[PDB]
Design an enzyme around this catalytic site. Structure first.
Site, PDB file in Angstrom:
ATOM      1  CG  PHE A  12      -1.728   1.333   1.474  1.00  0.00           C
ATOM      2  CD1 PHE A  12      -2.594   1.716   0.382  1.00  0.00           C
ATOM      3  CD2 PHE A  12      -1.738   1.641   2.677  1.00  0.00           C
ATOM      4  CE1 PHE A  12      -3.257   2.957   0.492  1.00  0.00           C
ATOM      5  CE2 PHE A  12      -2.669   2.773   2.835  1.00  0.00           C
ATOM      6  CZ  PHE A  12      -3.484   3.601   1.794  1.00  0.00           C
ATOM      7  CB  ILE A  13       3.240   2.830   2.517  1.00  0.00           C
ATOM      8  CG1 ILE A  13       2.374   2.781   3.478  1.00  0.00           C
ATOM      9  CG2 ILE A  13       4.333   3.757   2.300  1.00  0.00           C
ATOM     10  CD1 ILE A  13       3.148   2.518   4.944  1.00  0.00           C
ATOM     11  NE  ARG A  33       5.280  -9.662  -2.763  1.00  0.00           N
ATOM     12  CZ  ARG A  33       5.195  -8.344  -3.210  1.00  0.00           C
ATOM     13  NH1 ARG A  33       6.057  -7.332  -3.110  1.00  0.00           N
ATOM     14  NH2 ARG A  33       3.952  -8.143  -4.218  1.00  0.00           N
ATOM     15  CG  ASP A  58       9.777 -15.633   3.886  1.00  0.00           C
ATOM     16  OD1 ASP A  58      10.064 -14.827   4.230  1.00  0.00           O
ATOM     17  OD2 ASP A  58       8.903 -16.783   4.004  1.00  0.00           O
ATOM     18  CE  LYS A 165       4.512  -3.502  11.619  1.00  0.00           C
ATOM     19  NZ  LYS A 165       5.136  -3.050  10.407  1.00  0.00           N
ATOM     20  CB  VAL A 194      -1.133   4.386   6.850  1.00  0.00           C
ATOM     21  CG1 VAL A 194      -1.021   4.988   5.304  1.00  0.00           C
ATOM     22  CG2 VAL A 194       0.204   4.424   7.386  1.00  0.00           C
TER      23      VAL A 194
END
Length: 336
Positions: A12-13, A33, A58, A165, A194
């Site tokens: 997305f970003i 991927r 991966d 995170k 976001v």
């Protein structure tokens, strides 16, 4: 003619970073991927000269990024953006985040000969301890760290997510501070929730796999549904994407953690915006208590002090109404 590697280029970003990178005439090598993912990406942009991809199936495994690093020794920048139902939080979330991050930086260490700048997407979740975020008297800055323990990160999937995170980012700074010979700087982009549209309306599914699903979930409510509780900081995806680019183009961003937050929201904030900008939907989604959000944000959230991050970036962010509107507009029109 400088070359940038972007991992997870269909995210997305990431798609937004790619679009902005292409428009500044960088040569972009995205990692994806599969061939399908990569062919898809090149078609969205209509196969420009400046765009190409390599496959990394991966991105957390040992050596995942070696072959791409060796084949493209002219890369100066590495933008690391790459990332469902969790049984053991320890094996499925925390170790892959910590080990994935070490493996990525290790590949850049061995074979990233010309790599001079590295940008990693982290998260506001690595900055804010839950008890602090809930304190209306607290100030939170780029120096604050989520102080959750490893042990507490195993308790539940939300603690697991925010913990992972924090430990993923803790691992990156450990790497560059603990290893010698390190030739590249490292910057960190820590966005809150976001919001914002996808780079392409094609991409919209029924359930967004992104954080805009908070917004999407509003659109599926009936007029006398209760409004979900959801609150936090938010920032538009396009400003996050742009920050990734300012993060290596501006020299003062080296070894910085950049907080990306435009403001605060509750679900009522989103309801109010939608009810006031989409006459079509007004009456089909709830109203509950308009304006209730300002007292809730004032009463129960720390203040995010991103002054230094805003100085580092020097551009105006979208606001809630633009970001919410651009997102809903895209979703609604995409459903036809």
């Amino acid at each position: 003619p400088i070359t940038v590697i972007v991992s997870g280029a269909t995210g997305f970003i990431a798609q937004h970073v790619v679009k902005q990178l292409l428009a500044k005439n960088y040569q972009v090598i995205g990692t994806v991927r599969s061939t399908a993912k990569g062919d898809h990406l090149l078609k969205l942009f209509n196969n420009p000269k400046n765009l190409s991809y390599e496959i990394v199936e991966d991105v957390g495994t040992k050596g995942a990024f070696d072959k791409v690093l060796q084949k493209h020794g002219e890369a100066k920048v590495f933008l690391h953006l790459a990332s469902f139902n969790v049984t053991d939080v320890e094996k499925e979330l925390l170790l892959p985040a910590v080990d994935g991050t070490k493996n990525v930086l290790q590949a850049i260490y061995n074979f990233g000969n010309n790599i001079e700048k590295v940008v990693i997407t982290s998260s506001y979740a690595a900055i804010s301890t839950a008890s602090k975020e809930a304190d209306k008297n607290a100030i939170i800055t780029e120096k604050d760290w989520n102080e959750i323990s490893w042990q507490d990160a195993l308790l539940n999937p939300v603690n697991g997510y925010r913990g992972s995170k924090k430990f993923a980012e803790k691992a990156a700074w450990d790497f560059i501070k603990s290893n010698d010979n390190v030739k590249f700087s490292l910057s960190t982009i820590n966005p809150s929730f976001v919001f914002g549209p996808q780079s392409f309306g094609s991409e919209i599914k029924q359930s967004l796999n992104t954080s805009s699903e908070i917004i999407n979930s509003i659109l599926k409510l009936k007029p006398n549904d209760s409004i979900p509780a959801s609150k936090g900081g938010w920032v538009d995806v396009r400003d996050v994407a742009k920050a990734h680019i300012i993060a290596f183009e501006n020299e003062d961003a080296k070894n910085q953690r950049i907080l990306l937050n435009s403001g605060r929201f509750t679900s009522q904030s989103l309801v109010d915006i939608i009810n006031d900008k989409f006459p079509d939907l007004k009456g089909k989604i709830p109203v509950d208590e308009p304006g209730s959000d300002k007292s809730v944000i004032a009463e129960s959230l720390a203040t995010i002090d991103d002054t230094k991050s805003r100085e580092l970036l020097g551009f105006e962010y979208y606001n809630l109404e633009q970001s919410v509107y651009d997102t809903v507009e895209q979703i609604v029109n995409a459903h036809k």
